[PDB]
Amino acid sequence: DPDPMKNTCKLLVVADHRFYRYMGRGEESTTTNYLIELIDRVDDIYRNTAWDNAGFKGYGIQIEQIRILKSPQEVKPGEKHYNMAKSYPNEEKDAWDVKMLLEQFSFDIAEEASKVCLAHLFTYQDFDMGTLGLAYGGSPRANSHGGVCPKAYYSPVGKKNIYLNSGLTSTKNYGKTILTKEADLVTTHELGHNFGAEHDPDGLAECAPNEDQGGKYVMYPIAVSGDHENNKMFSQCSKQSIYKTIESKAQECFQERS
Numbered sequence: 001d002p003d004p005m006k007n008t009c010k011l012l013v014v015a016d017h018r019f020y021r022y023m024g025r026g027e028e029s030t031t032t033n034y035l036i037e038l039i040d041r042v043d044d045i046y047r048n049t050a051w052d053n054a055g056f057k058g059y060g061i062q063i064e065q066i067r068i069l070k071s072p073q074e075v076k077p078g079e080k081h082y083n084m085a086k087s088y089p090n091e092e093k094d095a096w097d098v099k100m101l102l103e104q105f106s107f108d109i110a111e112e113a114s115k116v117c118l119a120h121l122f123t124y125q126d127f128d129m130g131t132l133g134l135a136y137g138g139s140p141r142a143n144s145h146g147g148v149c150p151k152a153y154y155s156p157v158g159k160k161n162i163y164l165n166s167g168l169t170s171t172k173n174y175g176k177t178i179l180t181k182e183a184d185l186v187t188t189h190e191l192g193h194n195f196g197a198e199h200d201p202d203g204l205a206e207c208a209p210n211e212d213q214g215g216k217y218v219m220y221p222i223a224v225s226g227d228h229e230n231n232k233m234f235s236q237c238s239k240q241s242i243y244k245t246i247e248s249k250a251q252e253c254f255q256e257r258s
Ligand SMILES: COc1ccc2c(c1)C(=O)[N+](C[C@@]1(c3ccc(-c4cccnc4)cc3)NC(=O)NC1=O)=C2
Pocket: 098, 099, 130, 131, 132, 133, 134, 135, 185, 186, 187, 189, 190, 193, 218, 220, 221, 222, 223, 224
C-alpha cells in the first residue's frame, strides 16, 4: 500500500446570489459546472508546479463542498451579510468595498471555514480600480493571520471564532463578464496569496520578464490577461514563498487527493 500523501488543499467554494444570477443563469447545474471546471484548471497549474524545482510537486486543490446561495440574504436594519442584496458601505455602488466584503465573508462563513483548508467566495460585482479579487496572505508561521489552514481568531463583537483561510473572486470587471481564462488567473492569484506568495517585484527581472520573454507571471501586481505564456505560471519568487508555506502547513491541514 502506497504511503499517504497529505498534498491537497480542500476547498469550500461559495457562489453568492450575484454569481448564481449573472454567471450561473439562475441554475444550479450551470453554477456547479463553471466552478468545478475552473477549480480543476487552476489545480492543473498548482498540481504540476515543482515548488523546489525538484520533487516537491503534486500539491494542489480540490473542491470539498460547493454552497450555492440562490437568493439574497434577508437582513434586519443595520445588519449586514456578504450575501445581502445591497453593496456595503455604499449601496449606490455596484460592489462592496472589497476589504469589507472579504472580512464579512470570513465572519459569516466561519463555522464552515473551520473544517476546510480554504474557503473561497465567487461573486459578480464590479470592484473599484480594476480589482478582481482579494485573499488573506498565508505564510509558514503558526500565527499567520491568513491563508491556508484555519486558525481561530476570536471576534469579541461577534462572540465567536473567525478564520482567515479565505479569498474571493469576482467574474465582473468594467461592467462586463471577464473571459474564463481571466477568471482562472484571478482565482490562481488569490489562492497564490493564500498559499504564501507575495506580488512579483519589478526589481527581480527573473520574476517579472518582458513581453518578448513570455510576459509576467501570475503574481504580478497588475492583473495578467492570460494572453502570454508566463501568465498562467508561478515565478521562481512565488515558488520559493509558496514552497516554504506548503512545507510547514501541508502536515497541518492538507489531505489525500480524492
Ligand atoms: C490575475 O488576477 C489578478 C492579478 C493582480 C491583481 C488582481 C487580480 C486584483 O484584484 N488586484 C488588486 C488586489 C487588491 C489588494 C488590496 C486591496 C485593498 C487594500 C487595502 C484596502 N482596501 C483594498 C485592493 C485590491 N487584489 C489582490 O489579490 N491583489 C491586489 O493587489 C491585483
